[PDB]
Rosetta silent file (secondary structure, phi, psi, omega in degrees, C-alpha in Angstrom):
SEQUENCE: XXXXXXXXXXXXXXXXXXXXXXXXXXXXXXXXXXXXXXXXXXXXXXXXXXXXXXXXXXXXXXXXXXXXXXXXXXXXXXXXXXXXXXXXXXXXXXXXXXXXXXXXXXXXXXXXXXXXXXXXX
SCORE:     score description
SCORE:     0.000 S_00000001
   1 L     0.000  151.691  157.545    0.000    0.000    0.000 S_00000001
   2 H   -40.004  -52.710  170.532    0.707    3.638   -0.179 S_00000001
   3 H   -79.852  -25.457  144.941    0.227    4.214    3.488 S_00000001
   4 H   -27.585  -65.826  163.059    2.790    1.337    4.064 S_00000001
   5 H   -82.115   -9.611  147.594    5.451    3.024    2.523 S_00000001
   6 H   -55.663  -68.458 -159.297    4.593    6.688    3.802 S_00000001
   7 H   -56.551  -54.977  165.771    4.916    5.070    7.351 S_00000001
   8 H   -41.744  -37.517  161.167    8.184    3.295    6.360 S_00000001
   9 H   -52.662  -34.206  179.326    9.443    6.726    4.894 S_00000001
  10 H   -75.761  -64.539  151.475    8.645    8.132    8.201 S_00000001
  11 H    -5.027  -65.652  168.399   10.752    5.427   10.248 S_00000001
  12 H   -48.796  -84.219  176.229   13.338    5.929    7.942 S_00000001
  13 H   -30.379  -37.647  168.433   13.398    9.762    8.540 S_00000001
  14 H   -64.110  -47.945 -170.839   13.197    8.676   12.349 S_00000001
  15 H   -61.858  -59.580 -177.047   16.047    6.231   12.022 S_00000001
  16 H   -36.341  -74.040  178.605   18.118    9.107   10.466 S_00000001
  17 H   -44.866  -70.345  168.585   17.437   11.852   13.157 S_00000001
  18 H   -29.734  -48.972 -165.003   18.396    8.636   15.945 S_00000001
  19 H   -72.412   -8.796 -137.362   21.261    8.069   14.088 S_00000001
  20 H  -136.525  -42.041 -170.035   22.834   11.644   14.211 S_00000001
  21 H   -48.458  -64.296 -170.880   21.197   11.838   17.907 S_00000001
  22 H   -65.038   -8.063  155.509   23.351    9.006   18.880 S_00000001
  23 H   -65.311  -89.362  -13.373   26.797   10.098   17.126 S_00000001
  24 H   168.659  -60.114  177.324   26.340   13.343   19.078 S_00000001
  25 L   -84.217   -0.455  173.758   25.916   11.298   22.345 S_00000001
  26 L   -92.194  -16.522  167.103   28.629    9.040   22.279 S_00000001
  27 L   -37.742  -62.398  173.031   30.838   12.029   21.613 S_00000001
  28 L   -58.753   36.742 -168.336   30.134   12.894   25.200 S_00000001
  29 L  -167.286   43.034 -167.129   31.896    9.805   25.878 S_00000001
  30 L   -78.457  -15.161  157.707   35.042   10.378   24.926 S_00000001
  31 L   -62.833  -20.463  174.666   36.565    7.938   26.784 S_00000001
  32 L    95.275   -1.382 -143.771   34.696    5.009   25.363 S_00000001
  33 L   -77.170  -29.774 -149.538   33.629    3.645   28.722 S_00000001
  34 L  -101.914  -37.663  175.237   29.933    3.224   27.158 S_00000001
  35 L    -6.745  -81.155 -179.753   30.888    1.896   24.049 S_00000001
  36 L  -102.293  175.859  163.089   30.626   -1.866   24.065 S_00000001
  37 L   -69.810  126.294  165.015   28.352   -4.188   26.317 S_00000001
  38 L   -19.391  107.298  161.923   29.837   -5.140   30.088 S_00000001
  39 L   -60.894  132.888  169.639   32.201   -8.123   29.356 S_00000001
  40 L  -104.222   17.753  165.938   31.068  -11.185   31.210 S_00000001
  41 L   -92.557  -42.343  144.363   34.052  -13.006   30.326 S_00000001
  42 L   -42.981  -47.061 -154.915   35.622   -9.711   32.563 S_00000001
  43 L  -137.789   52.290 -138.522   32.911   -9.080   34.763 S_00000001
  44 L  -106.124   17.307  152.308   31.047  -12.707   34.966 S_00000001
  45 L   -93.944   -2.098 -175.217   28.785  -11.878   37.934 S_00000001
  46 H   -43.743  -63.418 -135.365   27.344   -8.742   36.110 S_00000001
  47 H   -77.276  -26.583  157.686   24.251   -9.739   35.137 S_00000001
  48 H   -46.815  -11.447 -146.097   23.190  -11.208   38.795 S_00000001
  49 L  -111.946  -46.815 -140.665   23.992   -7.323   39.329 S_00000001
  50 L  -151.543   91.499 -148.339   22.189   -5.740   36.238 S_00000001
  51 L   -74.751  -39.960 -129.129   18.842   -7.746   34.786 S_00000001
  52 L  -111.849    2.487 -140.913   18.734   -5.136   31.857 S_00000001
  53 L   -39.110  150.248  156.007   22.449   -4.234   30.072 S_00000001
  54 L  -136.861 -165.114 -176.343   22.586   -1.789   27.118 S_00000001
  55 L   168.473  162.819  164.045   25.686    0.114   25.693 S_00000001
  56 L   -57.590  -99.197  158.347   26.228    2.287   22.378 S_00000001
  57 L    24.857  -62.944  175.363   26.977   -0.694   20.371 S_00000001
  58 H   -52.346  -47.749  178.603   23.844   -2.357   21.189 S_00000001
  59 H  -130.940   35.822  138.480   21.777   -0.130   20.170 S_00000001
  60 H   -41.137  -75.555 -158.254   23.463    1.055   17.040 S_00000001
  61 H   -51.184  -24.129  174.565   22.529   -2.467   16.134 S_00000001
  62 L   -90.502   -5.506  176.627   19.161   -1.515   17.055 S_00000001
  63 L   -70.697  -71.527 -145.844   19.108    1.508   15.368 S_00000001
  64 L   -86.434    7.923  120.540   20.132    0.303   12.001 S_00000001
  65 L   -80.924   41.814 -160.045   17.401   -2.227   12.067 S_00000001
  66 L    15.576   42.328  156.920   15.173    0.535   12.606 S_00000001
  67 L   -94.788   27.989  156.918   13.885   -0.773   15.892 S_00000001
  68 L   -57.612   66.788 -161.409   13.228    2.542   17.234 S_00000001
  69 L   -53.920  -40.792 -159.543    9.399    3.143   16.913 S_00000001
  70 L  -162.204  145.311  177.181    9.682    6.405   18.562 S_00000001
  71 H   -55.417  -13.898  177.219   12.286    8.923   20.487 S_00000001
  72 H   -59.006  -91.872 -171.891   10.499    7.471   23.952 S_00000001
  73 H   -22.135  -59.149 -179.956   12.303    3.797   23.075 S_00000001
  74 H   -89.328   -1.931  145.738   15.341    4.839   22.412 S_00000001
  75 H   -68.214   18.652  168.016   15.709    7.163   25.222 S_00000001
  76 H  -106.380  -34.479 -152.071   14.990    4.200   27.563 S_00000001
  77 H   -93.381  -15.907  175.238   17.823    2.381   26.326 S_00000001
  78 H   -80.788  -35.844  152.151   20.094    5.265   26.745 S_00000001
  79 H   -50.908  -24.096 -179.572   18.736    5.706   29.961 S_00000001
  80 H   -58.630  -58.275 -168.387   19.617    1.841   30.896 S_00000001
  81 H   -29.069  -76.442 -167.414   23.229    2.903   29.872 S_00000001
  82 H   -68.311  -25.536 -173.975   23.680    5.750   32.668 S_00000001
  83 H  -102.753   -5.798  167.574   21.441    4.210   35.424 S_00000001
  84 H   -75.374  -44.038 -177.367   22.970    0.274   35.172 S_00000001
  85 H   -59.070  -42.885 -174.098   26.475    2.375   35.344 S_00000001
  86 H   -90.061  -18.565  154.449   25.383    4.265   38.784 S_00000001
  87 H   -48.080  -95.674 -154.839   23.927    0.841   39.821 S_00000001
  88 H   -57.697  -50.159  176.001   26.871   -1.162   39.493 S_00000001
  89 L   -95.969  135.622 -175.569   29.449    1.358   40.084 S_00000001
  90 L   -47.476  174.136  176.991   30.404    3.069   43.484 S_00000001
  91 L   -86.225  -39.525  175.967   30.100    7.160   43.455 S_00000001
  92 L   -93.824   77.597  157.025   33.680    7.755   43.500 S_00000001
  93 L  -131.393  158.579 -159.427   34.771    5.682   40.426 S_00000001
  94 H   -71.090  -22.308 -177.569   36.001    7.157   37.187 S_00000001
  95 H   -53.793  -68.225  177.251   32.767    4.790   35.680 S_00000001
  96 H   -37.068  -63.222 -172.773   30.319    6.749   37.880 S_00000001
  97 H   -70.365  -13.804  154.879   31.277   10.047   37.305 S_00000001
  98 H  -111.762   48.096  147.844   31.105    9.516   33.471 S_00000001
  99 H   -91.606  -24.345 -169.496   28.243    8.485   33.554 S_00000001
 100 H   -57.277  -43.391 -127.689   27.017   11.699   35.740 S_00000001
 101 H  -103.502  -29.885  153.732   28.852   13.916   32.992 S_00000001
 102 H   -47.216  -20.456  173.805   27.268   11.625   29.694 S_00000001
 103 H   -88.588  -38.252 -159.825   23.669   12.370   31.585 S_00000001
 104 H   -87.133  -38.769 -131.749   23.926   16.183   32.144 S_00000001
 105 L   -89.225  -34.571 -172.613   26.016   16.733   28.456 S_00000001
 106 H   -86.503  -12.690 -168.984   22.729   14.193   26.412 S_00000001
 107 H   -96.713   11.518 -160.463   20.109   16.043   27.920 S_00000001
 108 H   -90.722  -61.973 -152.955   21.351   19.255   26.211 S_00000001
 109 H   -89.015  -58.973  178.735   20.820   17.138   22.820 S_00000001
 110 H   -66.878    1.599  167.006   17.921   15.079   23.984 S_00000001
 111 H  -108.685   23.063  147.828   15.403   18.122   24.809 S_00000001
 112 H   -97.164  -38.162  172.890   16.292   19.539   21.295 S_00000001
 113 H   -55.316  -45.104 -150.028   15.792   15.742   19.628 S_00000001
 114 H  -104.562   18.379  174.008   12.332   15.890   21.105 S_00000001
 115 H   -94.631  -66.884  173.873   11.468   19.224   20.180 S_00000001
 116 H   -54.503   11.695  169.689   12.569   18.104   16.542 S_00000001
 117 L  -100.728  -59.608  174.513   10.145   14.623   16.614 S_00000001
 118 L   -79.554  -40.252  177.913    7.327   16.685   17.405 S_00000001
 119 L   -67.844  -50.731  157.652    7.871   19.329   15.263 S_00000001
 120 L   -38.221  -29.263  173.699    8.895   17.052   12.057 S_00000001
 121 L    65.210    0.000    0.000    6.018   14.568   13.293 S_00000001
């Protein structure tokens, strides 16, 4: 149908705007800390720790199978990022505190994403 491929055009257009959000927030990560997923060959009690893991990596992959529906979704998973990391990790660890500084620095970029979602529709 017609309205099939409007709503995939729109996705698409969504995926795009995600994609540029999330280059722009891992930047604010310049250390990389965020990057990849928690090794459990490294870390092999996380997940008794941390039911829910995400990372940049992760949900690239989820980006570029457009399995964003909407900016709510993938702002959960970015939220997972910074709030398993304040979970896991103590307040004075170098982990912790970038996560504090990756939370104040995306929310600059995420209340401008979600002014551009509604306005763009």
């Amino acid at each position: 149908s017609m309205e099939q491929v409007a709503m995939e055009l729109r996705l698409t257009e969504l995926t795009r705007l995600l994609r540029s959000v999330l280059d722009q927030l891992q930047d604010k990560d310049p250390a990389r800390i965020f990057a990849q997923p928690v090794s459990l060959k490294e870390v092999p009690d996380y997940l008794d720790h941390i039911k829910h893991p995400m990372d940049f990596a992760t949900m690239r992959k989820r980006l570029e199978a457009q399995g964003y529906k909407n900016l709510h979704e993938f702002e959960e998973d970015f939220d997972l990022i910074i709030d398993n990391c304040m979970k896991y990790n103590a307040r004075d660890t170098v982990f912790y505190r970038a996560a504090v500084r990756l939370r104040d620095q995306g929310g600059v970029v995420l209340r401008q994403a979600r002014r551009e979602v509604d306005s763009i529709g």
